[PDB]
Design a protein around this ligand. Sequence first.
Ligand SMILES: CC(=O)N[C@@H]1[C@@H](O)[C@@H](F)[C@@](OP(=O)(O)OC[C@H]2O[C@@H](n3ccc(N)nc3=O)[C@H](O)[C@@H]2O)(C(=O)O)O[C@H]1[C@@H](O)[C@H](O)CO
Ligand SMILES: OC[C@H]1O[C@@H](O[C@H]2[C@H](O)[C@@H](O)[C@H](O)O[C@@H]2CO)[C@H](O)[C@@H](O)[C@H]1O
Length: 377
Amino acid sequence: SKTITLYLDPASLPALNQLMDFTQNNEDKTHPRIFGLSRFKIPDNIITQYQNIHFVELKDNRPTEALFTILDQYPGNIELNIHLNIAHSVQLIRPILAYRFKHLDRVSIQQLNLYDDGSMEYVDLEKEENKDISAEIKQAEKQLSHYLLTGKIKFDNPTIARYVWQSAFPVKYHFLSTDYFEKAEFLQPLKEYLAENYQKMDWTAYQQLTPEQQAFYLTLVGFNDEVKQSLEVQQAKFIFTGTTTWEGNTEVREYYAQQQLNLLNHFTQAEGDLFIGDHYKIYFKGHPRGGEINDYILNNAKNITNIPANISFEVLMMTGLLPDKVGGVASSLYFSLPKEKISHIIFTNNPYVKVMRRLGIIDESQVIFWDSLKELG
Ligand SMILES: CC(=O)N[C@@H]1[C@@H](O)[C@@H](F)[C@@](OP(=O)(O)OC[C@H]2O[C@@H](n3ccc(N)nc3=O)[C@H](O)[C@@H]2O)(C(=O)O)O[C@H]1[C@@H](O)[C@H](O)CO
Ligand SMILES: OC[C@H]1O[C@@H](O[C@H]2[C@H](O)[C@@H](O)[C@H](O)O[C@@H]2CO)[C@H](O)[C@@H](O)[C@H]1O
């Protein structure tokens, strides 16, 4: 029996966790690993120190068939330790199961490790508030059984379908927010159902690595000393955080970057509605997929130090380089951001709002919206 480990994720959070897992095991230079990480590129130098390390592309939330050629290379009885992104867990496992059916005799699933895509699971879960959770579960179990037995996907409730994997494999979830599952009364049935198969993402796990591994991890998440240094200055610092849109329409995209830029000013300008004072060193932490959006801020802002968008915000917390204040559009990094560092959360009633509230990330006060801010200048 050989154990192949798969790390798959099209987003950020999962990847950050999966690579942390990988780091914790970097002593084992020859364990068969398959990385399917869209937002992270493992540096060659790290690659050449490992054996039986493969890479697979992701398309439409699923590993391409290149994954099959990989598996083909291991003829013995193999067991799969799969790490997946919760939100797209059903699609991400599709070709794994497909290949499995082509080899029931040899291939088997050892266990699953699922991680939150980000805020989506929570926004999506908030939309299931008036439903019979208990019923929803059983319904989902049965449909997963159908999926596992036919290779066919058909879920009445896609959101709930994400949390019924225990009915088929040994699994452990890692939640961006365990508080949400314990504070949303309407979720009790899912809470209880999940019983002991879950835990909170451990953000202090980097502190437990040996310094060498820490450097190693930092290498994976693309954190360099140059950036490390732009954060060394003893001056009080403020990190404007960016967001983005998935819409292609040039119109909606330009509007986003224009709203964001303007929001940036309400923070930094003295007549801004969100003015935080004038002694802070401003920095920009654009969304990873910011693209033209991130460029806009840098091309029209003044004295601001850019923090490479490909670096996930949670890394500043691990390396203790967190600033005094953070402000911008709502996104997943605020779910794990030390309370006292919150300057203000702006949104683009509203589910995302309800989640922030249930979690106490924001107070009872009037939530601020993108467009309620006057154009400055
Ligand atoms: C509801 C919904 O669909 N939420 C998703 C969420 O499940 C996930 F898909 C993601 O996560 P998102 O919350 O933005 O943030 C996720 C992580 O990405 C890195 N980050 C993000 C912004 C930034 N300015 N600096 C950073 O460094 C951090 O690691 C952070 O914790 C995502 O794109 O990965 O995007 C949002 C979308 O709402 C999109 O943001 C808005 O249309
Ligand atoms: O990148 C991970 C991220 O993808 C989001 O989906 C986007 C996709 O990335 C983009 O290329 C396409 O044009 O639009 C999709 C949304 O309609 C997921 O929603 C998010 O959860 C992550 O998986």
